[PDB]
Design a protein around this ligand. Structure first.
Ligand code: FE
Ligand code: FE
Lengths: 403, 403
């Protein structure tokens, strides 16, 4: 009702169900559990057992199931609760009564709904060459799987020209408008990632560089993802980003985020430990959060990662990605025209807004570290039967009970 | 002078030199530094700059150089110190006057001396088929590079039989002799890693399972590595391990560690967060440590990871890898014959011993967590111009100055 950046999630015909539960070791305990699944016509391939990372005498179970196993899940949970003796949380992509909204527990699980993507008013609409080019990029994303290198693509002189145009203009604004962290990293992206006016950087190169900075990594995505899916990725320090470029007809406009927006507005700040931790905090807070709060986190993300400004002493600079990759609004956000408010999540979370250019008002963050803590605080109010934390060693989410 | 487990390191014809230093951002600062290298005939390929993980206004430099750049390094360091203005630490594989013993800073750098490996009295010596088989495994290791999957190998029925023999005997001793953590994980290795009496598990499978538990990973190695090189790997939660198996002639003896020793004595405990942290602590303490302390850490490792026992209430169980993979000594270590001493690093570090079977005395650790703290404490006494820490996100070692 304003065309916001919030995108409700969708479930496939199979959806996804995950039973979170641990089990203290006992003679025949492990065999009992697995037998319980196996006996219910559940391929033990979707059943994984690992040593608990919290308690040395427990086992953590991971179940990769879907709506197909719904008819038996009930009895299985009852058995676990009453007979075997375990605390179980049911995750469901369909978010039904008594189930927690599904979220990936392992980095590999980001493959599941990575292809769940959202024309006539958009440039390149009636361009066959462009429409074909776009499908090519969408297919690279569709076929992508975690852990794989990101397919390199040779861009056309025309495309590189479109990039050049956007680059030049922004590069001439950064010094005076971009927050310190952005200006700090950019020179490295220029030196080691091919970030030039006459060159479109390859996603693989950018990804490897990011991992080497904050452990952040890219994942080619076909188009827009649901807010839940996209924000959740951040929890794993994974940035779902596009590989295509806007239509060369209008180099200063994009109905959606293209390679120019991703590389110039996002990448620099994801290379900063402070910003990476802050953005990850938003993702961790989205894990299993109710739709109502995903939307609120979506709004918070919009007024921060996308369109946020930050104090730089007595000065105010921009760090929002939608600002750092748009010369027009980058100049406008720091003008005497927009209304500024201090970052306050309870307020920001319910801030009304539209996706059209030149935002009427912006929120100013004290620092990325302050913003992060504010997110942590806000997350505590999000209704979920437990708390989450990311394990960079195993690249798996740790589900500890509410604190 | 007793044939200990300590192996002094060796340098190639090129060796390795790394200049650790950071630089606060300043107009022309970055360009100055890189120009300084470039002007000294140093390919800027061996010069890498990244955002400092500690201070948002600094850059961390990584230099992949070798003895070839020795004639110019002097002036370069002077320039950095006096002219540019930076604190530099020089790492050298040759450990010369005023240089710190070299160690990898990134996980990829473990490739450098991974192939630096250490017959007539050993079974299979005069066996051409075996000697050929061994070279095959050595070559898989020689050609291995970090990040690659570990080549799978089809083992012979004879080899599998040798494994079976060792397996059966040990499996029948674990319940009563193995520490809780080992017995806790084993059932999972049996269920998900092909750990059976009639099957030799593949290193890739074991590695993927380990990463999923404690972030630990395997790296096929040709033979014995220097203590410095091997212990240092632990800092990255990387276990350099063999892929070959002992000669089928003597299934209960191995002049060196084979797949049986690695998989049955090491892997289970590396899947335990507590043990992983403890072993990593030993590796981090070896980073840049003087030879004298590498040797001491080697002895500590021997009386812990290799041949250690731990309190399990009023009981005493075994967790040492050389014990958990040797039925004979596994039975002996818990007998009334060996002399037991409480783990005390100052003492243990200088404990005299030989590599022959059946150790006269063993050291008992309170727990893996206690042992870990003891290692931390001991490490503080190790002479190094700074302290280290591992970053699991970037998989790089963090060099913070002494605390
Ligand atoms: Fe964006
Ligand atoms: Fe060993």
């Amino acid at each position: 009702g304003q065309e916001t950046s919030y995108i409700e999630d969708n479930s496939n015909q199979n959806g996804a169900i995950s039973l979170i539960f641990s089990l203290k070791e006992e003679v025949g305990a492990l065999a009992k559990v697995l037998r319980l699944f196996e006996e219910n016509d559940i391929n033990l391939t979707h059943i994984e057992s690992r040593p608990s990372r919290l308690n040395k005498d427990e086992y953590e179970f991971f179940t990769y199931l879907d709506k197909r196993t719904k008819p038996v899940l009930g009895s299985i949970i009852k058995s676990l609760r009453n007979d075997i003796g375990a605390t179980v949380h049911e995750l469901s992509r369909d978010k039904e009564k008594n189930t927690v909204p599904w979220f990936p527990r392992t980095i590999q699980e980001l493959d599941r709904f990575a292809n769940q993507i959202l024309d006539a008013d958009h440039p390149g609409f009636k361009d066959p060459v462009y429409r074909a080019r776009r499908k090519q990029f969408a297919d690279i994303a569709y076929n992508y799987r975690h852990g794989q290198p990101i397919p390199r693509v040779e861009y056309t002189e025309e495309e590189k020209q479109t990039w050049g145009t956007v680059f030049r203009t922004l590069k001439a604004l950064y010094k005076t408008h971009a927050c310190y962290e952005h200006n700090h990293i950019f020179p490295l992206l220029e030196k080691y990632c091919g970030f030039r006016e006459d060159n479109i950087p390859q996603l693989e190169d950018v990804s490897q560089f990011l991992q080497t900075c904050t452990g952040f990594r890219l994942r080619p995505v076909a188009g827009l993802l649901s807010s839940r899916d996209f924000l959740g990725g951040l929890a794993f320090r994974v940035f779902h980003c596009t590989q295509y470029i806007r239509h060369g007809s209008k180099p200063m406009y994009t109905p959606e985020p293209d390679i120019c927006h991703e590389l110039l507005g996002h990448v620099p700040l994801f290379s900063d430990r402070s910003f990476a931790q802050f953005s990850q905090e938003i993702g961790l807070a989205s894990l299993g959060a109710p739709d109502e709060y995903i939307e609120k986190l979506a709004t918070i993300y919009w007024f921060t990662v996308e369109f946020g400004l930050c104090k730089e002493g007595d000065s105010i600079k921009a760090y929002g990605a939608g600002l750092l990759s748009s010369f027009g609004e980058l100049q406008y956000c720091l003008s005497d025209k927009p209304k500024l408010l201090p970052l306050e999540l309870e307020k920001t979370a319910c801030q009304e807004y539209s996706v059209t250019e030149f935002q009427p008002l912006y929120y100013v963050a004290e620092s990325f570290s302050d913003a992060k803590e504010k997110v942590r605080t806000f997350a505590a109010t999000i209704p979920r039967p437990f708390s989450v934390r990311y394990d960079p060693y195993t690249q798996r989410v740790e589900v500890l009970d509410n604190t």
